[PDB]
Amino acid sequence: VTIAENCTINGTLRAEKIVGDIVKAASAAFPRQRESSVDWPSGTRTVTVTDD
């Protein structure tokens, strides 16, 4: 669907991907290495943002 002017929804809009003037977000925790009864953060995390 292509709409050249305003589109109004009076109910629930459910889209998978939204592209425009929005705040995207992601989050993760570092891997933890442990021994006996003590653990510490040590590892790698990757965040990929797509140019769409």
């Binding site: 021994e35 006996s36 009864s37 003590v38």
Partner: protein, 211 residues
């Protein structure tokens, strides 16, 4: 609160002495074991957080130590100790100590001093045993002809061999570690506690004096 009852008998033998002491401590007098009380049972960890070191229980200490002189050339110190700390949280210990230190005087100034010591401590909560024996040989110059003549300068070589099957878990802090301050086996969940099984030899020079 706590109690400490001590009975010591000292006998004058062989130009020296022998002291046989029996001590029994209850409760707050068991954590330190020399005659001061710590009745709160709270200690600060590495990051200054409080944790429980409760000392409910008793302590029995049977000790016999002395100094003897054989001949005009031989002197000796000797030590035998058994200290059993039995606590309600099971974090007590059972410590055996046996030690000898002979001294041979070639000249009224110069002497050779040996020392052989053995320690054996069994943990109450794990049942494991840490043992060690240490032999040191020194040549010393002292201001007198007694094993107590001080201004003493020694050149020594020491060799200590130990085998430890348990240790204390002080890693992290008390909030994140549930075994903080507790005796654990040396191979607990991949950790390494105690000094392990090894031996080491040192050497050098030292001075000791009381005036």
């Amino acid at each position: 609160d706590g109690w400490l009852f001590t009975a010591e008998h000292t006998q004058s033998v062989l130009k020296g002495f022998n002291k046989f002491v029996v001590q029994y401590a209850t409760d707050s007098m068991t954590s330190q074991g020399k005659g001061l009380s710590q009745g709160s049972g709270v200690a600060f960890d590495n990051e200054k957080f409080a944790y429980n070191i409760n000392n409910n229980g008793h302590m029995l200490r049977i000790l016999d130590h002395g100094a003897i002189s054989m001949g005009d050339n031989w002197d000796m110190m000797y030590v035998g100790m058994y200290q059993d700390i039995n606590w309600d949280n099971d974090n007590g210990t059972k410590w055996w100590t046996v030690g000898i230190r002979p001294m041979y005087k070639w000249t009224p100034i110069m002497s050779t001093v040996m020392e052989i010591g053995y320690d054996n401590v069994e943990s109450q909560r794990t049942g494991d045993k840490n043992n060690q024996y240490k032999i040191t040989l020194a040549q010393q110059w002292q201001a007198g002809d007694s094993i107590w003549s001080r201004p003493a300068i020694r050149v020594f070589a020491t060799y200590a061999k130990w085998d430890e099957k348990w240790g204390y878990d002080y890693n992290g802090d008390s909030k994140v570690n549930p075994n903080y301050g507790k005796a654990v086996p040396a191979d607990f969940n991949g950790g390494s506690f105690g000094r392990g099984d090894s031996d080491e030899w040192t050497f050098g020079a030292q001075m000791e004096i009381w005036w």
